[PDB]
Scaffold this active site. Sequence first.
Site, PDB file in Angstrom:
ATOM      1  N   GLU A  56      27.130-142.913 -11.816  1.00  0.00           N
ATOM      2  CA  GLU A  56      27.403-141.800 -10.882  1.00  0.00           C
ATOM      3  C   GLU A  56      26.486-141.949  -9.715  1.00  0.00           C
ATOM      4  O   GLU A  56      25.503-142.744  -9.754  1.00  0.00           O
ATOM      5  CB  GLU A  56      27.222-140.419 -11.570  1.00  0.00           C
ATOM      6  CG  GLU A  56      25.798-140.084 -11.782  1.00  0.00           C
ATOM      7  CD  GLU A  56      25.645-138.808 -12.570  1.00  0.00           C
ATOM      8  OE1 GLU A  56      25.957-137.731 -12.021  1.00  0.00           O
ATOM      9  OE2 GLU A  56      25.175-138.879 -13.726  1.00  0.00           O
ATOM     10  N   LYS A  92      21.936-132.238 -20.813  1.00  0.00           N
ATOM     11  CA  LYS A  92      20.627-132.069 -20.216  1.00  0.00           C
ATOM     12  C   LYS A  92      19.820-130.992 -20.924  1.00  0.00           C
ATOM     13  O   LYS A  92      20.393-130.012 -21.462  1.00  0.00           O
ATOM     14  CB  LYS A  92      20.713-131.785 -18.742  1.00  0.00           C
ATOM     15  CG  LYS A  92      21.355-132.879 -17.953  1.00  0.00           C
ATOM     16  CD  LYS A  92      21.448-132.453 -16.510  1.00  0.00           C
ATOM     17  CE  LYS A  92      22.034-133.569 -15.665  1.00  0.00           C
ATOM     18  NZ  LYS A  92      23.512-133.589 -15.897  1.00  0.00           N
TER      19      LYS A  92
END
Lengths: 301, 301, 301
Positions: free
Chosen positions: A25, A155
Amino acid sequence: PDQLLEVSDEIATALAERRPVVALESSLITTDPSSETASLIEKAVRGAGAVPATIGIAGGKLVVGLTDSLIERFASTKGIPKISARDIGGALAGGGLGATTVAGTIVIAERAGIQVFTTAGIGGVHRRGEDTLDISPDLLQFRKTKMTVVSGGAKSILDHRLTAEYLETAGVPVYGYRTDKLAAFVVREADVPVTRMDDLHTAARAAEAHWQVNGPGTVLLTSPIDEQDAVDEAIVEAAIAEALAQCDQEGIVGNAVSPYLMKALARASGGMLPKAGRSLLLSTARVAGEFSAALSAVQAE
Amino acid sequence: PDQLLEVSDEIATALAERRPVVALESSLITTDPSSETASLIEKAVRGAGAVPATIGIAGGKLVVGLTDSLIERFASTKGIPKISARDIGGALAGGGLGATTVAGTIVIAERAGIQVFTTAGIGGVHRRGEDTLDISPDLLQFRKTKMTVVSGGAKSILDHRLTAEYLETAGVPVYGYRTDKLAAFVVREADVPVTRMDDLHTAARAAEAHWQVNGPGTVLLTSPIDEQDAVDEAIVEAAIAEALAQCDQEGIVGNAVSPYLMKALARASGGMLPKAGRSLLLSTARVAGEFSAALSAVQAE
Amino acid sequence: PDQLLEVSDEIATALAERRPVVALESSLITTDPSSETASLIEKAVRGAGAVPATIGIAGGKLVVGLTDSLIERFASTKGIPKISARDIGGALAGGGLGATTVAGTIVIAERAGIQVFTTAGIGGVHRRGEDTLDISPDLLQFRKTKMTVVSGGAKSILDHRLTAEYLETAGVPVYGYRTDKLAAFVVREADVPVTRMDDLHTAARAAEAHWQVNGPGTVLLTSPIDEQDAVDEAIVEAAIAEALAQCDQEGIVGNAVSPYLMKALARASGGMLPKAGRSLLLSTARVAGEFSAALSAVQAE
Ligand SMILES: [Ca+2]
Ligand SMILES: [Ca+2]
Ligand SMILES: [Ca+2]
Ligand SMILES: [Ca+2]
Ligand SMILES: [Cl-]
Ligand SMILES: [Cl-]
Ligand SMILES: [Cl-]
């Protein structure tokens, strides 16, 4: 041909030859202007014989394999918007640069024929997300896009158990590489079971049968952070619970809460948070490269 | 041909001839080693002229119509994993046995061309599921798979009203056979409205138009348990609220909570819980067989 | 041809010629037996050169462009059911009339080749919907149906921030026409950011690229109510919080709560609520007509 997609020569040749490619990404390439990281990451991916494909939006095009010129802009331009899948259309129309997130990048990777994507951590259900409904678009994008996403789980600022429950409801396979507990980003584990795969060729044959039976959709392969590099669960949680404790007394909710949690995390970690995230990024990228090799060989039979 | 699917001669002939077939799950064939149940169920399905198709995973294959040899293994082997749709890929790769759930079975039934599936109760939103996000994958699998699922509503340990709200948000049609209240498994009713269908040929024409307009997706036809066989709503709820009351004071949440609710239910029911579940299973299977006949005749015009 | 769809000559000619058409729902044509409204709305849509297509169900058919005879029935018949997408199948089977909602209408509009739909406000997450899971089917129907829905955001009785969070999780693009705050029906704004589009040709090029990359799915273009015509946020909220305050003390939840909120709103607004909703309806319809023109021109290149 395709008029939206610009694919570099190396990636277009690997795809034509059904050789392994791993998408990356750009939305975080911005978080390390060095580059040194992107260089260790490319090395980790190629060590398996996979081709790294960094993705973003520029000039009205979906770019697969950023040029040096482009990496430079993404490294050095101030205003760059983060682009999830729902923002792709406007980013293309606008003709400027866009750094795609997990959801944004895997849609572009899939359009080019890439089948593996890697990042240190995906989005998920945010803490208090059962009440605020603040949940990353990545989770439902995984019901549409054919991809294996390799990460160290969600995360750390997110709610690991709620994200795991939501992915189960969404029918998204969640495998643990050599483990039967869900990876918790810079923390080794959350107390959440996943399906253990001890071998990447078995994982690849499972992913392939998943696509053949259930159709286009994402398989999540989680690989925990090296035990030498983990942050103490207690340290992470106490820091987060306190950062939330200050949020209630200073009355902040909304998109304001999340970047406070991120800064509170840097603080509790000595200055090790970047170091731990980089280690997780490197080991996850290696596993992604090896997985992508093992999938090319499976699809070859 | 298809390399993943093994379909028995009887089922393959019924499908070729566009005759009525009803799929059955294996994940519970395991819950009655007798068999006597499977035998009453087959009888209930055939009484309508439908062919019963019991489904599971074995030997790297999706099996439609288990052999006697296979039913024996599913009856007598200790370690058999329960396989939802997201687990199909790994169950195939592993090459062992897998007992498929509602979500797992309807994906395999659809792949073979079967259009009706029956079971006593589907999964749904668990109690406190608005907070824990513990919600069965069946509900979103119904947005993808073309199937009519005939059941007595959601299992009793689930939250009936939340499951009904979630299915409405998901756009899944919910019909009541000769009733306008949602079936509540061994309890006759939840205080939740559904669309009454008094006639199965009308229900079948509604399902067919649903697929023609909205595309592949599941239609839920709920049929309540015989009034002579119902358990008292008060008995069920008090037993469940107490079982939850003990959970808070002994601090158990997670996947631990749900099997406690199941045992507390057996206990409050005298020993009638199995008897009531069997009656619901038999009457729902009859309705499924009759519905499947009425759909074959509708699709024949 | 298609055996379910009845399309008027004018709409069928506009579609054949790739000229702009805007769909309208019938479920509210029922809320104004006059007609005078439908007449101002048609005028607002045609002023841009778009063709208005009012949609409903009658006689076993999906009707695109109601006849005068049909508008008369929808205006004057007592028993008419409101039909969401999941109810279409049964409404067709029943052969009577059905007034389609946002979700119901856009599925029929899409089937005919119409790409723009307009209404004053869409459904969304209801207030306390994080706990009750009462959420309009419109939000997940937007993941399937290729459509631009032009509205003044969600209806005022709904939870604006939760609806915005849910649409973000669902990957549904949300644009603001000349604004970067979400429209709040008869209230100008909710404190919720959206992506500003200053120009409808840019919005149309963004929508088109969205469909080309992400596939069939809805783009929400929100256009707030004229500032001269807005109701005071404080008035709306106080009225709603009190109406909810009476609900708790009189113990009403379920589908009972929502129509109380609707009546409490009429009351707090002097008698201006209808006047404000009509202004929003007219200005949104104008924007829809202009957007639909700008999309036909974009798709023409
Ligand atoms: Ca959010
Ligand atoms: Ca669960
Ligand atoms: Ca709550
Ligand atoms: Ca509802
Ligand atoms: Cl789990
Ligand atoms: Cl309901
Ligand atoms: Cl937002």
